[PDB]
């Protein structure tokens, strides 16, 4: 129906239009020069000495590094395998593909680009052995791609993707080297876009869906397309801090020392060389300068500027950056009240930890759909209905505190006479689903020996 | 009867005027240029350097972040068994539809819309596999719509919805791309809108009831439409704190440095170039300037402003913002002290945890009212009377304190001999409805051993 | 009572929390004030005496 050659041109135009926005939020995480960061009191030459501030870098790192996927739950039709049997079950089936694609590496980065730019995409494909290599030919090839290299349009009504384009630049050439357009009926790619624009390689697929899904940082239902985590609220304090820091850095060159003056005798009577306007004051430490001092001469000085006036303002802005971001107060260095207690750590982490658990949910909702698409593509039939009830399992984002959990778990289990089954003891102690199913084997070895 | 094409236009004009209130609440939760925030001392060419403040966003997050649903409790059937568990009980049936719709994602978003705007809408609908091709076709589609997309007239007598309209925009000019009317016995959709309307795609339904249920952030009787949680007090403290940041930043750009002056000196004796009005002072440390007596000249300076004379005012407004919101004192960085112990933590959040336990009830009422409606959709008959008595079960909204839960619960149970039956200990430990339904199996698998 | 104190304190930061700088003896003409506007542009950067 729709002209694919037209739609490619039209979506490259839509894709380039998005880059005009993204260049503004990139500049906070990379800390490029920004117009609002320049310290106004600094003279027009010393304005070369920029003062890049790291709150955005810090705040996105401290989220994206806490996140980690550790498995999938697929609630079975009720039977001898309520969640797993240990091999040849849905949970193992997806975790195989996750390992084979190294998504533990890639998706850790994908969450970073999704927090910075506000969204990123999962693209699902069969591998082609005529084109791609170092991947298991029977698993689906899953890639995560940032919005600086891909764009997808959403039907606003159904909230599903209509079509999308991956656009690859020739690196330093600043030109499109290749483009790939994903449709509900097919993918299609024009393998070269430099020199002559080459003819399309099509590839059909059995899905009704288009084989791309967005991760989005969507904080609120009214944000119909994803939004950056580096909020306008945090951008303002990042730029405000840079001005204070740069005004201090100018003051530390011109003004941190008093300026000395003499109001008495004329330069020639002070023995100043009249051509240059100077004399070599031979100022080894103890020496006394003497002057004829005509007409009631005196000497005086302008004060040093107190640099701690700026330090008071940097301390105030650090207390604000802590309050807005919800980072622990120590991550800004904002106060020295180091939380030296097992429970006081849970208190200081509490808002960052809880915020991370919400990002885990909102990205887990996308990672479900990527696996629903991957299964539907690989197995060809419509999916078993338990995959609509799938749940991603994420590693606890709190700092370990291993010895506090350890004493508590052993107290509950009480050599099997206790409150909870051994298996729940392992879950609360925080071992992963893979560690749990591995650790069962060693328990059978130990019981078999006696 | 009433004309449905009249209702379409009438409700669309009711919705489109209502959005103007909502923009005044959006402008606090994400930082737009509020007119009242501008710090008046900043000179007119610097007024573009807006200061933004995180209190409204921090408060709306810290509430809506703690909320999570564990499951639905329906009271027991004839003979009053402890639970009807495993035998497809109404608790697992309602929880199945909750899982299958990903409402664990869409509710945690939609509650923030209900806090910011005061309302959000639960739509309950039959699956349409010929229109949405990636959902389980056996399960009722329950979807949450923000008040920037759905609007409903509420009868002030019965509190039922009388009718409701939904509308959405498909272009950057924000022309309506489609609209949908919900009526007591039917729904109608016009596939194109705002001039050039398409024919009404129509569907009857069995209910007497309009198929939309409002979540509303009520805090009193009367007040029945609910309110933004961003209350007039917290708004005025947000704006007052923003003004003081702008005056404090504009102070640092202008007056942190003492302005040096000389009186009684002729500029042509100082060698000022008369075209520029300037002379190149030689700036390096320990230069002494020499001046002729002139008039009987002397030097003097205007002082710096004391920047901390604003900081010891911001340190008041944080403490006001804490008291008017009930956040723990450290969320607004308003304390040098931090919680050392489990009881200090439990005391410090004692406001916030009860604010959240209150919101759990007020949104629980809407989620019960939505699920009773979904049963009448898919199961078709009149509702069995125990559903009128159901309860939502939410998480404990406090920060978890696992070691102090564990050596308490273990000590109560005392290897079965103690004060409590086993699986009360499991719910005191906060294991959810699903976690406890799973542990019955692992306990039985340990009970095989000896 | 606390509403009044908060409002005065906020207004003070807009008007009065800053030192006000005066020069006496100086003829407006000798300072080169543009007499139809009443102003001249102080270039403020760092240590310009």
What is the secondary structure of B285-304 as a DSSP string? TT-EEE---TTT-EEEEEPP
Q: Which residues in chain A touch residue C49, judged by CB atoms under 8 angstroms apart?
A: 259, 302
Q: HSE (CB half, 13 Å, CA atoms) of A60?
A: 26
Angle separating helix axes B308-325 and B55-66, nearest 10 degrees:
30
Residue B407's contacts (CB-CB under 8 Å, 6 or more residues apart) are A407, A408, A411
Beta-carbon contacts of residue B46 (< 8 Å; ≥ 6 apart)? A40, B250, B253
Chain B residues lying within 8 Å of A411, measured CB to CB: 406-407, 410
A58 burial via Cβ count (<10 Å: 0-12, 13-18, 19+): middle
* CB contact at 8 A, A66 and A108: no
Mutant choice from A38, A40, A43, A255 vs C, greatest count of C C-beta within 10 A: A43
Instruction: Enumerate the residues of chain A whose CB falls inside 8 A of the CB of residue C46.
Output: 41-43, 46, 250-251, 254-255
In this structure, the number of other CB atoms found within 10 A of the CB of residue A160 comes to 17
Strand order across the beta sheet in which A299-302 lies:
A299-302, A259-262, B288-290
Alpha helices in B121-210 (DSSP H): none
Distance separating alpha carbons of residues B374 and B392, to the nearest angstrom: 15
- Quick one: which of A60, A242, C13, A435 has its CA closest to B253? A242
Q: How far apart are CA B207 and CA A101, in angstroms?
A: 49
Q: At what angle do helices A103-117 and A90-100 cross, to 10 degrees?
A: 80
- Angstrom CA distances, B437 to A19, A417, B97, B373, B443, stand at 49, 20, 17, 26, 11
- H or E element: which one contains B189? strand B186-190
- Nearest by Cα to A345 from B184, B419, B403, B64: B403
Check C19 against B303: CB less than 8 A apart: yes
Distances in Å between the Cα of A373 and the Cα atoms of A126, A387, B138, B234, B434 are 11, 10, 19, 45, 27
A86 half-sphere exposure, CB direction, 13 A CA radius: 7
Kind and range of the H or E run holding A123? strand A119-125
Distance CA A418, CA A412 (A): 6
CB A154 within 8 A of CB A162: yes
What is the C-alpha to C-alpha distance for residues B194 and B177, in angstroms, rounded to an integer? Answer: 8
Query: CB-based contact (8 Å) between B316 and chain A?
Result: no
- Residue whose tokens read 């005044």: B24
Token pair, residue B237, equals 């403290």
Contact B57 A233 (CB under 8 A): yes
Q: Is C44 on the interface with A (CB under 8 A)?
A: yes
Q: Where are the alpha helices (DSSP H) in chain C?
A: 2-15
> CA A141, CA A139: separation in Å to the nearest integer?
6
Q: Which residues contact A95 (CB under 8 A, 6 or more apart)?
A: A71, A72, A433, A434
Q: Which parts of B14-132 are beta strand (E)? A: 69-73, 119-125
Cross-chain Cβ contact B316/C9 below 8 Å = yes
Q: Is-contact B235 B317, C-beta < 8 A?
A: no
Tokens of B392: 């939502």
Q: Whose structure tokens read 């399992």?
A: A393
How many other CB atoms are there within 10 angstroms of residue B189's CB atom?
17
| φ, ψ dihedrals at B413, nearest 5° | -70, -40
Using CB atoms within 10 A of its CB, is residue A7 exposed (0-12), middle (13-18) or buried (19+)?
middle
Residue B400: which of A413, A422, A401, A63 has the closest Cα?
A401
């Amino acid at each position: 129906s729709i002209d694919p050659e037209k739609l490619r041109d039209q979506l490259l135009d839509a894709f380039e239009n998005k880059q005009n926005e993204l260049k503004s939020s990139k500049a906070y995480y990379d800390a490029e020069r920004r117009p609002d960061a320049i310290g106004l009191a600094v003279p027009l030459d010393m304005r070369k000495y920029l003062a890049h501030v790291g709150y955005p870098r810090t705040y996105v790192d401290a989220i994206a590094e806490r996140q980690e996927l550790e498995g999938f739950r697929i609630p079975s039709a009720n039977g001898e395998e309520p969640e797993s049997g240990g091999e040849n079950d849905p949970a193992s089936e997806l975790w195989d593909w996750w390992q084979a694609n190294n998504l533990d590496i890639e998706a850790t980065l994908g969450h970073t680009d999704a927090l910075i730019y506000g969204t990123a995409y999962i693209t699902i494909s069969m591998p082609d052995p005529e084109v791609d290599f170092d991947v298991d030919p029977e698993v689906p090839l899953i890639r995560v791609e940032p919005p600086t290299a891909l764009y997808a349009e959403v039907d606003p009504r159904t909230r599903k993707v209509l079509y999308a384009i991956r656009a690859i630049y020739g690196a330093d050439g600043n030109e499109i080297v290749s483009a790939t357009l994903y449709l509900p009926d097919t993918t299609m790619t024009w393998l070269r876009a430099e020199g002559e624009w080459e003819a399309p390689t099509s590839t059909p697929h059995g899905l009704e869906m288009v084989p791309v899904i967005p991760i989005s940082n969507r904080t609120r239902l009214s944000d119909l397309y994803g939004t950056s985590e580096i909020s306008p609220e945090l951008r303002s304090v990042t730029d405000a801090a840079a001005q204070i820091l740069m005004n201090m850095q100018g003051t530390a060159n011109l003004m941190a020392i008093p300026q000395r003056l003499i109001f008495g005798a004329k330069p020639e009577e002070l023995g100043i060389n009249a051509e240059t306007g100077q004399r070599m004051f031979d100022a080894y430490m103890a020496r006394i300068l003497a002057f004829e001092g005509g007409e009631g001469a005196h000497a005086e000085q302008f004060s040093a500027a107190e640099l701690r006036n700026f330090v008071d303002a940097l301390d105030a802005l650090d207390r604000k950056a802590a309050s807005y971001s919800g980072l622990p107060p120590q991550y800004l260095s904002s106060s020295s009240d180091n939380p030296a207690s097992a429970e006081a750590i849970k208190a200081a982490e509490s808002r960052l930890v809880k915020k991370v658990e919400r990002k885990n949910k909102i990205f887990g909702g996308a990672w479900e759909q990527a696996m629903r698409l991957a299964y539907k593509m690989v197995k060809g039939g419509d999916i078993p209905t338990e995959y609509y009830r799938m749940e991603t399992v994420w590693r606890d984002p709190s700092t370990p505190t291993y010895a506090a959990k350890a004493d508590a778990a052993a107290k509950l289990f009480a050599n099997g006479a206790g409150l909870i089954p051994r298996e729940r003891g392992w879950v609360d102690m925080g071992y992963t689903i893979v560690e749990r199913e591995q650790m069962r084997q060693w328990l059978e070895q130990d019981q078999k020996q006696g």
